[PDB]
Amino acid sequence: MLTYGAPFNFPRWIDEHAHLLKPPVGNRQVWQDSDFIVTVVGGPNHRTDYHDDPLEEFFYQLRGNAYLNLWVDGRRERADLKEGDIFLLPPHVRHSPQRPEAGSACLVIERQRPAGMLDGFEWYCDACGHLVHRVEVQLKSIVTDLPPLFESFYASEDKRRCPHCGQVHPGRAA
Amino acid sequence: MLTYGAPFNFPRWIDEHAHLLKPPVGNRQVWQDSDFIVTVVGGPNHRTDYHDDPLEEFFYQLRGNAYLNLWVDGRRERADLKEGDIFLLPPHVRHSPQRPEAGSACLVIERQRPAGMLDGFEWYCDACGHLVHRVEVQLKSIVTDLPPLFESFYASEDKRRCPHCGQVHPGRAA
Ligand SMILES: Nc1c(C(=O)O)ccc(Cl)c1O
Ligand SMILES: Nc1c(C(=O)O)ccc(Cl)c1O
Ligand SMILES: [Fe+3]
Ligand SMILES: [Fe+3]
Ligand SMILES: [Fe+3]
Ligand SMILES: [Fe+3]
């Protein structure tokens, strides 16, 4: 049987769940308990973290503009997602999605991570660019597991303290 | 590094490769050698086969209309893909994509199949609806491996002969 239901108009679905896309992630999963994690992400979001996904991530910026802050070698990069753009991210490339515009919508498709394959969430220093803190987690829900992790980073100056130059990361204000 | 390149406008990409989408599949893969198999499928295609994918398949009918002939229990069903519709197909649900309109375009995303996980391609009888022929293959390319398989079915009345009522499947004319 069609465990995930019949086909349905996507633009309409987005219009109807627009009000449900809220910070910090701006996340909303389309189907539950599926191998393909299909989500729509809107704005304005609030991400100061760099995600380290063990698998690839597909992007299709349907509405509005957004961009991904990245690290390509050891340098911070910016990959813009102009409305209409699609993009496939190689596994493990560090990325921090910046979605500043309201009414924005990007289709993001990922995969359920196999047991033992963990996701990483990182923060780097503004000053020396050194790694400040990293949390590895067996990701069970890209919609609910995230906010709690960030909150623990923001609630601790010890986690935010750069082990290289001692600078304390701005927390939820960077 | 961005092994798959930078983001790019999708509508434009489709406009530029429109002429490359041809029968029987109407297939075109966006990125090569990736875990996520991202393809755009246009029309008019020519499919008389039912695909048995061991993994899920994501659909997003971007341009035009199409439909999937299915089997939901033992009955032939039809799941329409109206322009704008998205759909996630559970693994193994038998489906035969019918894409009759030219200039049509549907985003189809699947996964690279792990060794040992085979794909099935089937044909059923018009008369008794019984299974007429099934080929299992370690799918290495949903863009090039398909046509050769179908051609062998069409070139053999023995493969097309229903083991239940003896009716010979119409081949590439059903
Ligand atoms: N790319 C994202 C995004 C995003 O693109 O906004 C949000 C959540 C997660 Cl888990 C991601 O991997
Ligand atoms: N759904 C499809 C389609 C399709 O939707 O047209 C084409 C090729 C393959 Cl291998 C598929 O699984
Ligand atoms: Fe990510
Ligand atoms: Fe520092
Ligand atoms: Fe299929
Ligand atoms: Fe028959």
Cβ distance B59 to B89 under 8 Å?
Answer: yes
Q: Is the CB of B25 under 6 A from ligand 2?
A: yes
Instruction: Report how far residue B162's alpha carbon sits from residue B133's, in angstroms, rounded to the nearest whole number.
Output: 8
| Burial group, residue B18, by CB count within 10 angstroms (0-12, 13-18, 19+) | middle
HEC-encoded secondary structure of A30-46: CCCCCCEEEEEECCCCC
Cβ distance A124 to A132 under 8 Å?
Answer: yes
Query: 3-class DSSP state for residue B137?
Result: strand
- Atom index in ligand 1 nearest the CA of residue A110 equals 12
Residue nearest to atom 7 of ligand 1 (CA): A25
CB contact under 8 A, B6 and A87: yes
Structural tokens at position A67: 């961009």
Structural tokens at position B133: 């022929």
Cβ atoms within 10 Å of A30's Cβ, excluding its own = 22
Measured in angstroms, the CA of B112 and the nearest CA of chain A are apart by: 12
CB contact under 8 A, A10 and B60: yes
Residue B159: its H or E element = helix B157-160
Structural tokens at position B129: 């609806």
The resolution, in Å, is 2.0
Task: Give residue ranges with CB within 6 A of ligand 1.
Answer: A 25, 27, 41, 51, 53, 57, 97, 99, 108, 110, 142
Instruction: Report how far residue B12's alpha carbon sits from residue B5's, in angstroms, rounded to the nearest whole number.
Output: 16
Cβ distance A153 to A171 under 8 Å?
Answer: yes
The residue among B28, B36, B69 with the most chain A CBs within 10 A of its CB, best to mutate, is B36
Q: Is the N-terminal amide bond of B7 cis, ω within 30° of 0?
A: no
Does A2 map to a domain?
Answer: no
From the list A47, A50, A48, the residue with the least C-alpha distance to A122 is A50
Instruction: Report how far residue A27's alpha carbon sits from residue A43's, in angstroms, rounded to the nearest whole number.
Output: 9
Instruction: Report how far residue B158's alpha carbon sits from residue A135's, in angstroms, rounded to the nearest whole number.
Output: 59
Structural tokens at position A24: 């910090």
Does B1 map to a domain?
Answer: no
* CATH code assigned at B56: 2.60.120.10
Structural tokens at position B50: 């039912």
From the list A144, A149, A150, A143, the residue with the least C-alpha distance to A28 is A143
Residue nearest to atom 9 of ligand 1 (CA): A142
Residues in A touching B67 (Cβ below 8 Å): none
CB contact under 8 A, B58 and A73: no
Cβ distance A27 to A21 under 8 Å?
Answer: yes
In the reported structure, the alpha carbon of residue B26 is separated from the centroid of ligand 6 by a whole-number distance in angstroms of: 29
In the reported structure, the alpha carbon of residue B34 is separated from the centroid of ligand 5 by a whole-number distance in angstroms of: 18
Instruction: Report how far residue A174's alpha carbon sits from residue A158's, in angstroms, rounded to the nearest whole number.
Output: 16
Does B2 map to a domain?
Answer: no
The structure was resolved experimentally with X-ray
Residue nearest to atom 4 of ligand 2 (CA): B97
Does B119 map to a domain?
Answer: yes
How many helices and strands, by DSSP H and E, does chain B display?
3, 11
CB contact under 8 A, A87 and B111: no
From the list B27, B30, B21, the residue with the least C-alpha distance to A86 is B30
Does A72 map to a domain?
Answer: yes
Structural tokens at position B7: 């983001």
From the list B31, B86, B90, the residue facing A3 with the nearest CB is B90
Instruction: Report how far residue A163's alpha carbon sits from residue A133's, in angstroms, rounded to the nearest whole number.
Output: 9
What residues are paired with A85 via a beta bridge?
B9
Instruction: Report how far residue A41's alpha carbon sits from residue A144's, in angstroms, rounded to the nearest whole number.
Output: 13
Cβ distance B150 to B49 under 8 Å?
Answer: yes
Could you list the beta-strand ranges (E) of B26-90: 36-41, 50-52, 57-63, 66-71, 76-81, 85-89
B132 is in which domain, residue-wise? 9-174
Cβ distance B71 to B77 under 8 Å?
Answer: yes
Structural tokens at position B139: 């799918």
Instruction: Report how far residue A77's alpha carbon sits from residue B1's, in angstroms, rounded to the nearest whole number.
Output: 11
Q: Could you tell me the CA-to-CA distances from A109 to A56, A85, A113, B12, B91 in Å, in that order?
A: 9, 14, 13, 21, 17
Residue nearest to atom 10 of ligand 1 (CA): A142
Cβ atoms within 10 Å of B97's Cβ, excluding its own = 22
Does B3 map to a domain?
Answer: no
From the list B2, B35, B85, the residue facing A10 with the nearest CB is B85
Backbone dihedral angles phi then psi of residue A98, each to the nearest 5 degrees: -115, 115
Rg (CA), chain B: 16
From the list A31, A56, A86, the residue facing B35 with the nearest CB is A56
The count of structural domains within chain A is: 1
Does B84 map to a domain?
Answer: yes
Measured in angstroms, the CA of B105 and the nearest CA of chain A are apart by: 15
Query: Is the C-alpha dihedral spanning A29, A41, A160, A114 positive or negative?
Result: positive
Residue B106: its H or E element = strand B105-111
From the list A38, A35, A93, the residue with the least C-alpha distance to A69 is A93
Q: What is the DSSP string of chain A?
A: --TT-S-EEHHHHHHHHGGG--TTT---BSSSS-SEEEEEE-SS-----EEE-SS-EEEEEEES-EEEEEESSSSEEEEEE-TTEEEEEPTT--EEEE---TT-EEEEEEEPPPTT--EEEEEE-TTT--EEEEEEE--S-TTTTHHHHHHHHHT-HHHHB-TTT-PBP--TT-
Measured in angstroms, the CA of A84 and the nearest CA of chain B are apart by: 5
In the reported structure, the alpha carbon of residue B109 is separated from the centroid of ligand 4 by a whole-number distance in angstroms of: 41
Does A3 map to a domain?
Answer: no
Instruction: Report how far residue A31's alpha carbon sits from residue A10's, in angstroms, rounded to the nearest whole number.
Output: 12
Structural tokens at position B60: 């997003």
